[PDB]
Amino acid sequence: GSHMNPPPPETSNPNKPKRQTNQLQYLLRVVLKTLWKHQFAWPFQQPVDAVKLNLPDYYKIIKTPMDMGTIKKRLENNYYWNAQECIQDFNTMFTNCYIYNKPGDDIVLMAEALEKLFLQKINELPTEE
Ligand SMILES: Nc1cc(Br)ccn1
């Protein structure tokens, strides 16, 4: 894409230790599956393209970007050591939306619907075995 967008968050690095856990499997098979297919997922399925959206200040304000396309790759390509890393990525994505946008903007309402589903699913995150 454009040189004016930052490189996306890391999704591959052999030096980072990796693990499969039952919790990370739940995050892929239950949490990501649920949110990815939601009617309101589409703004969150890839990094924000601030050039295409004409938001030149986006990456001036958002210095810790995250999106569900990145999270999907991280889950599918076993990037994580634990569930907390992945939950933090979802929380970062939601907070980016809430910080950048006005409350009640359409994307904020969309994020809030996804976050409500996320919370329900994370409250049922299984005990680590
Ligand atoms: N100068 C710029 C930068 C971005 Br990113 C988008 C539009 N104009």
DSSP character string of 103-117: TTSHHHHHHHHHHHH
Helix axes 68-76, 83-100, angle to 10 degrees: 170
Resolution given for this structure, in angstroms: 1.1
Number of domains composing the chain:
1
In a domain, 115, yes or no: yes
Peptide-bond breaks in the chain following residues (C–N over 2.5 A): none
Å from CA of 4 to ligand 1 middle: 7
Q: What is the CATH number of the domain that holds 84?
A: 1.20.920.10
Q: Please give the Cα distance from 102 to 96 (Å, whole number).
A: 12
Structure determined via: X-ray
In a domain, 100, yes or no: yes
| SS3 letters across 33-84 | HHHHCCCCCHHHCCCCCCCCCCCCCHHHHCCCCCCHHHHHHHHHCCCCCCHH
Q: Please give the Cα distance from 97 to 112 (Å, whole number).
A: 10
**Residue 29 CB burial class (10 angstroms; 0-12, 13-18, ≥19):** exposed
Å from CA of 52 to ligand 1 middle: 9
In a domain, 10, yes or no: no
Q: Which of 2, 1, 117, 6 is nearest to 64 (CA)?
A: 6
Domain containing 34 equals 22-124
In a domain, 31, yes or no: yes
* C-alpha 19 chain-centroid distance: 19
Q: Please give the Cα distance from 10 to 98 (Å, whole number).
A: 23
In a domain, 120, yes or no: yes
In a domain, 15, yes or no: no
Site to probe by mutation for ligand 1, drawn from 2, 4, 48, 100 as the one with most ligand atoms within 8 Å of Cβ, is: 4
Å from CA of 50 to ligand 1 middle: 7
